[PDB]
User: Fold this.
Amino acid sequence: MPTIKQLIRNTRQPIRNVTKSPALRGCPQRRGTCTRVYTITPKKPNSALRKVARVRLTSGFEITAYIPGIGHNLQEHSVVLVRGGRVKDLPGVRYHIVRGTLDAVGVKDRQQGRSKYGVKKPK
Amino acid sequence: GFGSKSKKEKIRDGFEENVVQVRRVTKVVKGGKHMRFRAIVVVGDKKGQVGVGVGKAKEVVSAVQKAAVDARRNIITVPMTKYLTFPHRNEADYGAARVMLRPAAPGTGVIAGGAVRTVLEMAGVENALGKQLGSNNALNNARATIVAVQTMRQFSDVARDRGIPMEELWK
Amino acid sequence: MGKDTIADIITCIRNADMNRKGTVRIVSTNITENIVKILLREGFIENARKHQERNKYFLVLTLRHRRNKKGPYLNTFHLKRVSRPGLRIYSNYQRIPRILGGMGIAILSTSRGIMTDREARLEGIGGEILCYIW
Amino acid sequence: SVEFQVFCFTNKIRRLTLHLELHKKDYSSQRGLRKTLGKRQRLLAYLLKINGVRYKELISKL
RNA sequence: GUUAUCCGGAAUGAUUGGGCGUAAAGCGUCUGUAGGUGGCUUUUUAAGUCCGCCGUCAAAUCCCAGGGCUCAACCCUGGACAGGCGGUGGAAACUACCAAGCUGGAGUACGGUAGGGGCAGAGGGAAUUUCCGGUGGAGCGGUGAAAUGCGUAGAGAUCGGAAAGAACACCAACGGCGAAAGCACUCUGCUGGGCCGACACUGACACUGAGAGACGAAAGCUAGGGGAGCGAAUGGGAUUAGAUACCCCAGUAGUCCUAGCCGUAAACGAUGGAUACUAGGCGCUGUGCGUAUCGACCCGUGCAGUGUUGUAGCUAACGCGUUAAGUAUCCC
Assistant:
């Protein structure tokens, strides 16, 4: 790439920081409607039953979001609040569900790091 | 075989030692898969006197001190004219690790990557800033700084080499 | 006789002493004559001699050395071009660089003649930076 | 001598062309004809770059 | 604290600051338009460039220094480097310009010189197959071993007679030429290109090349010939559990030629082109000078090209190394 004419045509441009969440497309976290609350398995090295809610969003997408924590109240057609963040083990799950927010209760009996799970103080 | 190596260790006030990485490097044999320890030790007093050294042995501490005995026969002196900083900027690659060194104001502690910062904080320089361009390696990095501070000249020996009598210098 | 008459001399310098040979033969144009005139007097080289071969006046230039070493010259010469043909560079009397604090010089084309940083910093003039050596 | 180069290349293209058109498949001398056309063409842009009237005479001669 | 958005880190789009032998990456090679860069000397204008002065780039923000709120945040007063554009006065080294010379770059003229460079026309002989004769009589051919096949309608073998197409043994060399693909039986014709010398001439006419144009192994296709060998597909036999395959026997398109189309290949040196510079040894090819003889040698050399080990330097390493993957410049 000489300074003359292969480069005052253009070098090229890198695209963007590609969006790591194609939904949520305004901004960070977005209200959701539960459609399925099924349970899938990770890839080969792990072994678990991870419990994800496939959730329709208010944006216009439908997307399978993970449910953190131990206990979960989430039945059919409830309302959640999804956020970004890639669960590695599950192919397709791109998102999380916030706990302690609207119609998704905090986890049962947790006393270490409660702000990630929406549990008020005991004691 | 006199014992306990008290006089023979030479208590190392003169050269202070640190590792900069101890990677376990392993070879496989017919019987299996056995490892030795490669440690990289940078020795040097804070007077301006440092040098790297690799070593590998099946023990950790014999690899460290073995790399030290390899290191304390490999010393350059640092051309560091002013108030513990550098004469001029420099860059010198070794292998595929390029190192840009740049002198600093005296109100600046040494800021560099871990291998470069290790061989400069052992070099007793206080005021430098060296970016590393290239490898993630630690050995060729540090040895590239050593080559990057051999080839560095003061003003007195450049004034001696050119023959110009003296000016153009604040101090 | 290629595209550049200044990478001519300069690349003959680098290629001269990187093979440790202390002798250069180059053409003697006006700007080469001026560069070796402002370069012998700055302690980098030893002597420049004009002569002729087929009535074509050339410069043979003797480089510096020291004594019998691993390499008989210690300080590697490190010549470098800046204002390439096709990318001209130009500086005021502000931008004009003190190379390594002053251990190098930046030979450059003033309206006076071609100077160094000493002889263009005191003038206050600026111009096209040919090349800086260090 | 320039007009002997242009005129000499013109007779070169005449004799090589009346070779090639009655022959029609030599793909080696095609390069010779095209190097002669390009070489002559850079000469004509050269003498046109120098002069007006004199290059007008070079056009009017052939 | 998590998330989202942006910059950094990221030299991970590179002017500062990357690469293209093998890691991602050099077009298949070549001609050349636009365009880009460009030899030396002398002179002229100053468009670029530089210097002075002047105008302006609102205020707020940022920077410096003061001052005010108990400090800070914030507020306020004054100041300015950059840097942009314009006006004006100066400088002329570099780019450009104007003019005039110059030759080493490049060509041409001339004399040689080497060549499987290309195309066309003639001519050649081995060998193979088939046919036609004479002989003779049971196998020939093939394989890891067999078999299918052919053979008493006389095979194969041997001698002679024709015809046919295709390719051109030894020479053949780590060799010559072409831009690449390619090019070797010989001869002729037309014609390209290279290399070397003398100043014989012109005087920078140069390099690269977007888009473009040409050529471009083999297989493929249209049209017409031709068809011995070989031989996809196919068919039979074998091996095999099976065999659409390797083996064998037949064998069609194709192979060759005319006129086209197609435009791809590991089109490979896995290396775009050009110029300048940087150890040597051992070679080969072409010419040139001197020695030696007076003539073939033979030695050194001046160049150009081709090869092999190899210093420096580069490289992640392997390696490359005057034909660089070295040092630099230009262009895609």
